[PDB]
Design a protein around this ligand. Sequence first.
Ligand SMILES: [Ca+2]
Length: 335
Amino acid sequence: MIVKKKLAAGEFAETFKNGNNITIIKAVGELVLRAYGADGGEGLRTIVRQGVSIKGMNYTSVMLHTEYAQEIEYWVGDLDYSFQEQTTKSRDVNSFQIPLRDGVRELLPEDASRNRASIKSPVDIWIGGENMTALNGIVDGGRKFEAGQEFQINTFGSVNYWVSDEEIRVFKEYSARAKYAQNEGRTALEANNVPFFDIDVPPELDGVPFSLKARVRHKSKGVDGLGDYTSISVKPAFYITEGDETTDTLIKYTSYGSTGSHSGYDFDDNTLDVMVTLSAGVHRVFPVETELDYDAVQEVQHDWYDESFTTFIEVYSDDPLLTVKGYAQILMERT
Ligand SMILES: [Ca+2]
C-alpha cells in the first residue's frame, strides 16, 4: 500500500487497520531530521534521516516523532518485495536539426528512450519546462543559452524553447517613395540610385518557388503638387537578377495594376504578391514603379528614375524555409 505522511509541527499518528505490509520491505521517504516508531503489539522507536529500505516488523499503527516541523511530505510504500534499478546506458546516437520557429514551442518531446541531448542554437534561446510562457516577448519560467553555446539536457520529458515572436521573416521597410524604372539592367538601376536588397537563396531552396510580398502604398493627391482628381496608373514590380549580383539581366515580377486618384491611407495599402523561383546564391531585388503615367509627365514633369507615387512600405516573405529563425543542432542518445 502506498500511503501519505505529511508535516506541521507535532506528532502524527496514521493508524490504518491492516499491517499486510508487516513482514515487508518499506520504501520509506525521509527529509532533514525526524524520529519514528513501530506499534504492532510492542511500542518501538526509530530514527532515520535519509531515504532507506527497511525490513519487516509488526505494525498496527505508526509513531511519528518530530524535531523539525518544516520538513516535507513522503510516501512510505511498504511492499512484500520492492526492487527498482535502471539508469540506461545509451546504445544509439542520432544527429539532426530542429526548425526553430516563433513563440513557445516544444524542443524535445517526452521520450522514455532519451538519455541525453547535446544542443547548439545559432541564436540566443530560452529553455524551460511546461511552465515556460512568453506573453509579449518576455519569457517567464525559462533561462537563456547563448547563440553558439553548446549545452546539454539529460531528461526524458518535454522541453520547451523560445527564440522569437515573429510569424514570418522582413527584407526592407522604406519610407522613401520608390523610383520609376524601366528594365535597364542591374548596373543602370544602381547607377541611378534605385534602392535594392539581396536574397541569399540557400541550396535547400535551389529552384524552389516561394512567395515574395510587399505592402505597397500609392499616394498621388497633392503629391509634388499633382491635381487631387488626376488619375494615376500604377504597376509596382520587383526587378530581380536571374543570375547573381554580378550579372546584369533583370526579371520583372508583377501581380496587380491599379488606377485612380490615390489618397494613400494606411488601411488602403495594397499587397504585391508574386511567386519567384531562383537558383541557389545571391539575387539582387529592386522594388520599383514600372508605370510612368502620362498625367504625371505633363503636370509635375515626372521622368524615369524620379520618385513615383509608389512606396514599398514593407518587403517581406512567408516561405517556411525562411520564416524558420534557423536550425538547432542536436545530438541525441537513447537506450
Ligand atoms: Ca493617367
